[PDB]
């Protein structure tokens, strides 16, 4: 069945640095955007919804809205990569990626932040 994997389930990061966390999923020879959904959250708070080849436009000022982005050029290589810049103490916690691309699955990644 469709399985999402992580190269690391824990990242330890320094305050003020930049961090990229990754989930991996099965590739086709051609990235079919119509079928792909990429969902990133921290705890239950949504960070990314990449649907139909489009990022869901957020209007609410939030912690993540200007510092978080999905590295879209990595999707065709089977990498869901979330880059968060200028890491803050509040960025510590449990992240989850859910990818749907035919089947669907999810994994969790913990981030610890040092100051």
């Amino acid at each position, epitope marked *: 069945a469709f399985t999402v994997t992580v190269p690391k389930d824990l990242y330890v990061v320094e305050y003020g640095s930049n961090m990229t966390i990754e989930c991996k999923f099965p590739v086709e020879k051609q990235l079919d955007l119509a079928a792909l959904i990429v969902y990133w959250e921290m705890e239950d708070k949504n960070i990314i919804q990449f649907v139909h080849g489009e990022e869901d436009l957020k209007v609410q000022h939030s912690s993540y809205r200007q510092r978080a982005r999905l590295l879209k050029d990595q999707l065709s290589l089977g990498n869901a990569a979330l880059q968060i810049t200028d890491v803050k103490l509040q960025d510590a916690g449990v992240y989850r990626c*859910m990818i749907s691309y035919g089947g*669907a699955d999810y994994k969790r990644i913990t981030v610890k932040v040092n100051a």
Partner: nanobody
Framework: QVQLQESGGGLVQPGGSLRLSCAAS????????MAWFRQAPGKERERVAK????????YLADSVKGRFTISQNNAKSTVYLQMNSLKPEDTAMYYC?????????????????????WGQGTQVTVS
């Protein structure tokens, strides 16, 4: 975290009706995306209904549009599937499922693999 428990299954003749309930508990944000899935023996779980609890926005699979309805109570501790005009092909174990997905993802994700929380299932037989 989240727990889900179904009730309401049974046996009806064609044209009959059943009402399923899913008693939902745990942090509301962790179960804002509610769904009903069904599994016939020899087949995969397939989604038939979706509700985002915060907006009330619902979605029904083409196979059940106009026959089934998904809803919740005021406290949002219970989610229902009202099943009218039942047909033999509706025979299956029915499951409630929950997760945290906001819309549009909640609407668009039909694979059972996406959902982390599940009820134990309830049998619906139409014969």
């Amino acid at each position: 975290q989240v727990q889900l428990q179904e009730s309401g299954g049974g046996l009806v003749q064609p044209g009959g009706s059943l009402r399923l309930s899913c008693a939902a508990s745990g942090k509301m944000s962790s179960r804002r995306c509610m769904a009903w899935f069904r599994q016939a023996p020899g087949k995969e779980r397939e989604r038939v209904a979706k509700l985002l609890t915060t907006s009330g926005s619902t979605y029904l699979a083409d196979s059940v549009k106009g026959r089934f309805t998904i809803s919740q109570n005021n406290a949002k501790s219970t989610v229902y599937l009202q099943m009218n005009s039942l047909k033999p092909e509706d025979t299956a174990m029915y499951y409630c499922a929950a997760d945290s997905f906001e819309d549009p993802t909640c609407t668009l994700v039909t694979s059972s693999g996406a959902f982390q929380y599940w009820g134990q299932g309830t049998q619906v037989t139409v014969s």
